[PDB]
Amino acid sequence: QKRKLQVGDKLANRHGNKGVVAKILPVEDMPHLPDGTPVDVILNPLGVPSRMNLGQILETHLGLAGYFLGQRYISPVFDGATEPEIKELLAEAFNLYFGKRQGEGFGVDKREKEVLARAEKLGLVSPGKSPEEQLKELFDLGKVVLYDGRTGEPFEGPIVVGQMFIMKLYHMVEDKMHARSTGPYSLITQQPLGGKAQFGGQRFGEMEVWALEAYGAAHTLQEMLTIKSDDIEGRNAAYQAII
């Protein structure tokens, strides 16, 4: 089978950041950049400070320069690139990018100004400098100007983007998914057989039982212990009642 990436499939980077696929969004609406090139993923920053993995931040930072400069990078463990060097790479990359911009018969977007204003007020970029130097000082920081594809008005603040190496993990929904109504039962006791293989139903744990007792749902727990599990005529007469 050819399995194409689905909704709810495991994904990760080398830096230990996991997650599944939540609602693949249409290419139409994407937080793109001035060139009109949409972003492929859009991860959530929240997981970053807790995990304390800044390797993904630096991978993104290097990738941001790599997308433009068109060259990969080699950074060995505990030997390699530093902030000044990376910032230099981003400086060169920006110097070429903005060059293609002004060279294609364009200039600073009004939305870019809209972001640069508040970026200047919060002290992210040095005031008094032209929007060239401001968007430059913003660029090497890893942050750039992003336009929301849904609306078309930019985001009120800059957003770090770039090339991150991301891995598609083993676990997939096509496999891990399962469910059952009626089917196989153990020979010893009339309980079903847990797992996708035997095509059985889930097991209700002792603590799940405890939870049900805590809610005080009598017939729910009663059904769990009898009607849908090991009861001889329970599941039968039930099935007939529903039918």
Binding site for RNA (CB under 7 A): 18, 171
- Map residues 100-119 to x or -, x wherever contact with other proteins holds by CB under 8 A: -----xxxxxxx--x---x-
H or E, element range at 121: helix 110-121
Least distance (Å) from other proteins to the CB of residue 134? Answer: 14
DSSP string, 171-191: --HHHH----SS--B-SSSS-
Q: Of these partners, other proteins, RNA, none, which one is at the site of residue 211 (CB under 5 to 8 Å by kind)?
A: other proteins
53 binds other proteins (CB under 8 A): yes
Least distance (Å) from RNA to the CB of residue 18? Answer: 5
Least distance (Å) from RNA to the CB of residue 9? Answer: 12
Distance CA 29, CA 125 (A): 29
Query: Are the C-beta atoms of 103 and 96 separated by less than 8 Å?
Result: no
132 binds other proteins (CB under 8 A): no
Number of residues that bind other proteins (CB under 8 A): 122
Select 45 or 232, whichever has its Cβ closest to other proteins: 45
Least distance (Å) from RNA to the CB of residue 10? Answer: 7
Q: Which stretch binds other proteins (CB under 8 A): 53-61, 92-100, 191-199, 228-236?
A: 53-61
H or E, element range at 209: helix 206-215
Q: Of these partners, RNA, other proteins, none, which one is at the site of residue 70 (CB under 5 to 8 Å by kind)?
A: none
- Nearest one of 158, 118, 114 to 138, comparing CA atoms: 158
Distance CA 35, CA 181 (A): 52
Q: Burial, 111: exposed, middle or buried (Cβ in 10 Å; 0-12, 13-18, 19+)? A: middle
- Map residues 170-209 to x or -, x wherever contact with other proteins holds by CB under 8 A: xx-xx--x---------------------------x-xx-
Least distance (Å) from other proteins to the CB of residue 187? Answer: 27
- Residue from 88, 91, 96, 163 that binds other proteins (CB under 8 A)? 163
Distance CA 162, CA 166 (A): 12
C-alpha neighbours within 13 Å on the C-beta side of residue 157: 7
Least distance (Å) from RNA to the CB of residue 194? Answer: 11
Query: Are the C-beta atoms of 134 and 98 separated by less than 8 Å?
Result: no
- Residue from 19, 91, 96, 149 that binds other proteins (CB under 8 A)? 149
3-state secondary structure of 213: helix
